[PDB]
């Protein structure tokens, strides 16, 4: 008894189940309501030396489906389910296979054509334009992205030259987080002009050559 154990009780009882292949429209009609608890009646008639299986569509559902059996000796099929509570079980073993076919022949293809046409609705084709499009590259004083970027830069303003003591304290404090910093990244952290930051960094900091990526600045003066 474990989570991965399979409840093979159904196999012990040798429960028999039937596998049926049915078209989409029959299932599509069932999927319409799918909550009324009724979709039709399955009628099986047997004779002295012949058995026939047929299915009737519900009158409400519509607003004959003859069944042909198939051999199951060439392959062994079993049915199992995965419970939402992670409890797998075996419903049973398939004992017979049957197929559902449309009674009608001529007018039935009309529904097939609509199904194909319906499947073609997502399919898209190139469309003709009587007149040449003239709404492209419309004259504009300045691109919307360019003005918005300028507005952000103008609002933010240029970085100011903070006093050396404040910059030095910020540089030393950030040194705890990581051993070495990149010049571009360090500028963002300190938020100071590059030229001013480099001079302050040069006064104490030095750059070490690393053969893996490149030479980078080291905050440690020694």
């Amino acid at each position: 008894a474990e989570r991965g154990e399979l409840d093979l009780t159904g196999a012990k009882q040798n429960t028999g189940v039937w596998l049926v292949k049915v078209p989409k429209y029959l299932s599509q009609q069932w999927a319409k309501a799918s909550g009324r608890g009724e979709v039709g009646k399955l009628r099986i008639a047997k004779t002295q030396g012949r058995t026939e299986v047929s299915f009737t569509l519900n009158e409400d559902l519509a607003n004959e489906h003859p069944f042909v059996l198939q051999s199951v000796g060439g392959q062994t099929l079993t049915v199992f389910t995965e419970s939402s509570s992670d409890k797998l079980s075996l419903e049973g073993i398939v004992v017979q296979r049957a197929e559902c076919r449309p009674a009608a022949s001529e007018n039935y293809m009309r529904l097939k054509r609509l199904q194909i046409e319906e499947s073609s609705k997502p399919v898209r084709l190139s469309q003709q334009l009587d007149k040449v499009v003239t709404t492209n590259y419309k004259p504009v004083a300045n691109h919307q992205y360019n003005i918005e970027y300028e507005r952000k830069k103008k609002e933010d303003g240029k970085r100011a030259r903070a006093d050396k003591q404040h910059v030095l304290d910020m540089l030393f404090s950030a040194f705890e987080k990581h051993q070495y910093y990149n010049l571009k990244d360090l500028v963002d952290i300190t938020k100071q002009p590059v030229v001013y930051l480099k001079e302050i960094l040069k006064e104490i900091g030095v750059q070490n050559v690393k053969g893996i990526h490149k030479n980078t600045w080291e905050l440690k003066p020694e």
């Binding site: 030095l168 030393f172 040194f175 705890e176 006064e203 003066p221 020694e222």
Partner: protein, 171 residues
């Protein structure tokens, strides 16, 4: 900075203090006061006392206290000449001009006063390396002499041909 930022300010403050002209040593606690590092950790107080303030080549332990090391740094023309002489005598090598300039304020006066006593080698990055001018054996000649000497190609000759010339000319 914790365990790393405090020491940097101590060194910077100490360096600036010396530039003012105060050669008097300063205690660990005294220096901490003007560096706004009074809340420094206790383990750093002993670490700086035992390691940072002794291993560094710019910290001098005097009467227990610590003072700058202007003696090691070149601050006079005579010291500049002596340092180069020791380098040549012991074969230590040259010193970049930038290193002398920071150690020796107004190094131009000392460099020009010594004149030819300093040999300048220009690095590709404009950096100048100073070497002692050993005046024991000197030999300077006209430019064309080297030009003719350069005209005499010798790298493109074999040993057999080079040595054959000796007997060819009878020497």
């Amino acid at each position: 900075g914790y365990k790393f930022g405090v020491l940097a300010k101590i060194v910077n403050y100490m360096k600036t203090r010396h530039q003012r002209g105060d050669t008097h040593p300063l205690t660990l606690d005294e220096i901490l006061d003007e560096t706004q590092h009074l809340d420094i950790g206790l383990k750093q107080k002993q670490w700086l006392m035992t390691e940072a303030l002794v291993n560094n080549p710019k910290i001098e332990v005097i009467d227990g206290k610590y003072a700058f090391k202007p003696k090691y740094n070149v601050r006079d023309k005579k010291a500049l000449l002596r340092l180069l002489d020791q380098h040549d005598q012991r074969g230590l090598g040259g010193i970049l001009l930038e290193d002398i300039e920071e150690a020796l304020p107004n190094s131009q006066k000392a460099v020009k006063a010594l004149g030819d006593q300093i040999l300048f080698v220009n690095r590709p990055d404009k950096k100048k390396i100073l070497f002692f001018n050993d005046k024991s054996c000197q030999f300077s000649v006209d430019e064309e002499f080297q030009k003719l000497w350069r005209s005499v190609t010798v790298d493109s000759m074999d040993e057999e041909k080079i040595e054959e010339y000796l007997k060819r000319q009878g020497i």
